[PDB]
Amino acid sequence: DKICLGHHAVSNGTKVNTLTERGVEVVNATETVERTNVPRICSKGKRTVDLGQCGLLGTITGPPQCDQFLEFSADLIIERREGSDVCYPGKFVNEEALRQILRESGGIDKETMGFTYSGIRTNGATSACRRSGSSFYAEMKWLLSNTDNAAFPQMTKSYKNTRKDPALIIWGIHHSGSTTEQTKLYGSGNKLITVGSSNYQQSFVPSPGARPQVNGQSGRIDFHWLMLNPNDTVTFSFNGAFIAPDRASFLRGKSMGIQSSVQVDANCEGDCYHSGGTIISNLPFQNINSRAVGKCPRYVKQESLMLATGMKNVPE
Amino acid sequence: DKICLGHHAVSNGTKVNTLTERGVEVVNATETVERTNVPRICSKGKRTVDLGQCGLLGTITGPPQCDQFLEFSADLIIERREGSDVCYPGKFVNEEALRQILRESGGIDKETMGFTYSGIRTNGATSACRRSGSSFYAEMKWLLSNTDNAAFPQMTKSYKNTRKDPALIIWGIHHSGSTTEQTKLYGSGNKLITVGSSNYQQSFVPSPGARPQVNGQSGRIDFHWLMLNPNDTVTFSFNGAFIAPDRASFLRGKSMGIQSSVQVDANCEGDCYHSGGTIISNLPFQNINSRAVGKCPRYVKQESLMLATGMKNVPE
Amino acid sequence: DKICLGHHAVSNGTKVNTLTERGVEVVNATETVERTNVPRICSKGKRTVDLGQCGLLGTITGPPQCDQFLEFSADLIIERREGSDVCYPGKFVNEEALRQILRESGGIDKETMGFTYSGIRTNGATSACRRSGSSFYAEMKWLLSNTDNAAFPQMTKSYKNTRKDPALIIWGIHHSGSTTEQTKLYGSGNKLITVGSSNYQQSFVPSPGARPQVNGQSGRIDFHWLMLNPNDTVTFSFNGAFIAPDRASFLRGKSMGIQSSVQVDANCEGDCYHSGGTIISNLPFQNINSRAVGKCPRYVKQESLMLATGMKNVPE
Amino acid sequence: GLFGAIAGFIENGWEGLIDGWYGFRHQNAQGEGTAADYKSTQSAIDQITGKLNRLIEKTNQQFELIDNEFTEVEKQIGNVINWTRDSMTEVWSYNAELLVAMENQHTIDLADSEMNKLYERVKRQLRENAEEDGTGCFEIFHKCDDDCMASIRNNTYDHSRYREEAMQNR
Amino acid sequence: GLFGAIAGFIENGWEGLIDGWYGFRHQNAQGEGTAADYKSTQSAIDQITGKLNRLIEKTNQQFELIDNEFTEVEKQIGNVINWTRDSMTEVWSYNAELLVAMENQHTIDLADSEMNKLYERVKRQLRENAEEDGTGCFEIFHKCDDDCMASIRNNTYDHSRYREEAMQNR
Amino acid sequence: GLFGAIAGFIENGWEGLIDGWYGFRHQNAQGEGTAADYKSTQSAIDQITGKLNRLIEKTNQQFELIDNEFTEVEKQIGNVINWTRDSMTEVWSYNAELLVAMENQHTIDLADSEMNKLYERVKRQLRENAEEDGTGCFEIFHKCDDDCMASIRNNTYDHSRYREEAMQNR
């Protein structure tokens, strides 16, 4: 006598929002915002370097904690809160720029600057940098006057980059904890260091004085850097208080750098990382960490945005 | 004999734009872009500090016009065009960073640095900073040699931050209008000031010379700042030309800072501010000021975007 | 007996994407992403200045290659890879800020600083800047001691901006390739240059030393700049190693600056430019160059996004 | 519109209809009369109201000053800030324009939909007892007094009561 | 919905319909029976599946760190970065909200559309042999056994076979 | 499509229809003939044209260089610029993709709507004088010559003239 048309329905629908209404109940729906974090750095298949105690900028200068990271190779570089760039206290000028360069480097290759010295000492060492006895930054040389109080000679040292890629060149200016210490190490007088390339132009005069003790030392070293272009030359004209580079650094290729507080895991894979771990998801959005890096779902403020995958639910 | 279906209509409809047509007339519509400004800073219910003649950075150093703002407390801080940071002429290094810090501070609390002095004068004063007679920045001390021409002694002064929040530490370097004035105030010789913390590393040598007269003075003071972390120490090693801090500053909490040319009004409330007043609106967009701050409708280029709230209008 | 309704169709439809399906075939469609570049700078109707060998910053100082660009007027300014700012080697502090200013300037007008000199030489010249014989930056004066080794006198020079717009003021600090050269040119002693306005406060001490040879010279000049406000004064207090400005620069109006490697063409017009040419298009998006400037379609990653302009194509 | 009723087969709207959005206008022995439909009107109003509830607000997202109107920031960073702000202005102006155009298209189509639904609902009520005119009018074959018209509006109309005489009056 | 079938003239859905999205429920001399419609169900499913294929992904766009959680960057540049990041957060949160709301509106209307299309397809099959109830039901005038009902579902129904008796039973 | 006419109950389109978008194809004693419908075609064309008028443009918003291709800017600020530019690229690529997908869905549904409206308009004209086939065809019961077919197309058709003979030929 009659045939009637209809559609399915369920007792327990799922609420979604539309242009016209909040909390419309539909037969089924699915989440578009990722909330689940994996509390590990998911590193399966990636050449990974976990710096631990070594500060990223220490890979260039070489305090004792960075001895095993002087020429690393990596797809993924992990900095840790406990990492330190220094042994004898000090810091890099333009430090974060240099960190950003090294994070993307793919690692570093090192080559000798070819500097030889006469008329001065080359073996400055300190109890702040220990390798079973007093020592110093593995990639640098603390140049001193031949004997106590002696005049450091006016020196010039040159290095040409004969490779096809830019060379990362570092040096340091030593600020003793006192003027008397400055004289004892490098002789009296107002010291000077100039550094120039075809691209670069900058000078340095030391300023000794008492800083509060760090790693048992009241002196400081100002570290500085420049990228030396292929077949360009850097000249160092100095007359004391100069921490000379022993080796130049070259970038190997490409990598990504992260900062994290969680363990590496080679059993999971992911490309979106933050300090608390890895966001593994195919969803378009995430509400886990606005500073996640790599290849990530877009960060949004909402905890949940349900996408309807069914018709409106109309139970009897 | 017949029943006929229909819909309402009006003589005077409102035009809107659609995906497919410009200026479609609909029964009613409403504006989505705010154009109405309130020409006052609507400050009802908010702890408000209108700086007037006091420059925001003056709250830290204390020229005479900032005497009533040395320890203010605020939810909303208002800078005015007439505000000045200085009395004796000069300026802060990294000035805008420091303004951004102070705008968000919730105000400042001050505590003594605990510096005491011997062998030098502590009461440098100038006609540029008047408090019924020559005076100086209320939070700073102009250190001079005991008598004219006398050698200023090589000095070191230390302050540890024993509080749970970072301390804002300021100092100044005085550049006299001439070398002779520099000798008269601090004795002859090339002067030096170093400043270091566990986080910070920087030096200063003065450069005297004739600048054009500002507030009747051809000399200048370079003001400098750093945030001193909890249980870290700052050391000042100086030998003249040094404007010493008398007090450290501490941030109270949270605030917002604005720049405006209009009067405060405690009879209206709003959270979106610009130099010309307050945008009070629940509309999603505004075309009043692209630099409005606080909690605002999004700035857009269009003067009007009408949202249809009725059907298409079809009059006979 | 019957009338039947239908719609048109074609054998060769065009595929588009919808919300619900990829590659739906429609009767017709049109591209929304521009892929066609014009390999020329399309400059019809615009006052255009192609700098060629002249570096943009050279227009202010005046090395020989910029002799015809000392007072240019322009709507469109074109920098070339071969452009150089210098003759005697050196560089500007805050160089890119100054380039951004000059790119938007509409060109420059020059006016004498009105500086006259006594007791010193004014005609320093070099083989690095040739104009049929040794010469120097056309807008600057290389101030030397009257004779070899002689003491340069402590000097002050003042300029007030009496115009209604800010004046661009430049100067240079000369760093000789050696200390002996510095003494020969300006006499012995540690030199000093201070510069101040009501807005500006900064100092300079030279640092001589061997840099690698550029344009046959191991010395360098540090160029510096400031904008001098209407009815403000700049004072130069110097005692050697100072490259003095002969003229102030004033901005003419408005322009746009580009960098390009292709020829100008006055037969085509366009407002979107990049190094490879001009994007001439009315389409909303382009996939040619993410760094295109002017008035451009938005850059997107997709090569093509077809917009349906017909119904779904349903062939028999 | 998509449903071809408003500004479609219905020639025009009624300025006299001040009681609702959609309504009935009848012709019978007793004369002419107009009445608004509550359900259709209310469905359209509630949906438009829902759109406004969504759109008419701003976020709790606070932004602070990053430049300075009294003392200009350094030129390079200032130019980066301006470029970023202008880029955001472009994004939001585009977003605003498209949002309102999309919403407006949907709003007009939605109203047209409600009109169509009301028409088809009445059509089903009057099966065989009436025929479509084509102007949004239903020609009724049997005599339909005010109580009969009110029964159609109130959805209490019984077609079986009149079917015989209406079918005979084909 | 826009088409007024689901949550419209069809009073409610069937919890017993576990075989598909849309289906037939009949009444005849042989009793009652329920069967799902494959084509309508599959069209709706394929369209929803298509939406998910588009949305459920992230781009191959890599971003690196530009600030530092261990050692804070300089305050001015840090504030520019935060302002930019917060601006992007606002843009994307707005984009996400609107995308899902738009998609959801369309998804519900799309399902309602498929239900309507199925109803009208059946209506055309049964021309003159049946009449619309108004509840999504077709009252058939001739006797229609399970083979007859199955022919309607399977789209093999021949109205000319039954037309005479059904037309007579007007 | 949402209206189930194009790629729906109408099996396929006509390659021979080169005169318009929508048209009529008839069968009578005099033979077969095809003619395009101006109003429906023009409504669809004007709406698509309107979309193009909106989309096919760029803004008057000028942007300047903030970095440098010949002499690289400082690395930190350069990285901030690149991050910002890449973020904008992501926003705009997303915007472009979604805009075109949304517009395309609407364009296809809009064309399908116009086809449906034309069908229902004809259905109303021919009340009782014809019946729906289900393939987009109207079986007419009375004899309809070329002048009669032309009257349907031209919207001058008078159903009352033929009603008696057509109703008799039920």
Ligand SMILES: *[C@@H]1O[C@H](CO)[C@@H](O[C@@H]2O[C@H](CO)[C@@H](O)[C@H](O)[C@H]2NC(C)=O)[C@H](O)[C@H]1NC(C)=O
């Ligand atoms: C960034 O944009 C602002 C405006 O948004 C520019 O400042 C304006 O400059 C014009 C003319 O130069 C004045 O009329 C206005 O008073 C200024 N407005 C504000 C709010 O300050 C500013 O110059 C731009 N920044 C840079 C670096 O050029």
Ligand SMILES: *[C@@H]1O[C@H](CO)[C@@H](O[C@@H]2O[C@H](CO)[C@@H](O)[C@H](O)[C@H]2NC(C)=O)[C@H](O)[C@H]1NC(C)=O
């Ligand atoms: C920029 O925003 C970050 C957070 O996104 C701020 O850093 C946070 O600071 C709060 C309290 O000051 C701490 O609880 C968090 O540990 C910090 N988070 C991170 C990720 O560092 C930061 O202060 C802001 N930048 C500036 C210049 O103020």
Ligand SMILES: *[C@@H]1O[C@H](CO)[C@@H](O[C@@H]2O[C@H](CO)[C@@H](O)[C@H](O)[C@H]2NC(C)=O)[C@H](O)[C@H]1NC(C)=O
């Ligand atoms: C910012 O991005 C640009 C490209 O948009 C980078 O410059 C490119 O560098 C690659 C290889 O290093 C070259 O092949 C191109 O010639 C460069 N393109 C341009 C337009 O200059 C640039 O290195 C990035 N910035 C930073 C700070 O890394």
Ligand SMILES: *[C@@H]1O[C@H](CO)[C@@H](O)[C@H](O)[C@H]1NC(C)=O
């Ligand atoms: C309903 O949606 C979820 C996605 O969140 C899915 O996992 C599940 O299989 C779906 N269930 C049915 C019956 O379709």
Ligand SMILES: *[C@@H]1O[C@H](CO)[C@@H](O)[C@H](O)[C@H]1NC(C)=O
């Ligand atoms: C029409 O819209 C405006 C909103 O701009 C509103 O204030 C007014 O009450 C509305 N009028 C009617 C009759 O709905």
Ligand SMILES: *[C@@H]1O[C@H](CO)[C@@H](O)[C@H](O)[C@H]1NC(C)=O
């Ligand atoms: C189809 O579209 C293109 C736009 O890409 C246009 O140039 C062409 O004229 C159109 N053809 C027809 C027949 O409409």
Ligand SMILES: *[C@H]1O[C@H](CO)[C@@H](O)[C@H](O)[C@H]1NC(C)=O
């Ligand atoms: C640098 O000079 C050497 C000459 O020995 C040449 O082989 C190399 O190609 C040069 N590279 C560049 C970038 O000029």
Ligand SMILES: *[C@H]1O[C@H](CO)[C@@H](O)[C@H](O)[C@H]1NC(C)=O
């Ligand atoms: C600083 O040292 C004191 C020891 O007196 C301790 O109470 C305080 O917790 C320390 N704070 C930090 C941050 O180490």
Ligand SMILES: *[C@H]1O[C@H](CO)[C@@H](O)[C@H](O)[C@H]1NC(C)=O
């Ligand atoms: C500068 O001073 C002169 C006085 O001769 C005056 O004409 C001019 O308006 C002043 N400009 C400003 C900006 O104060």
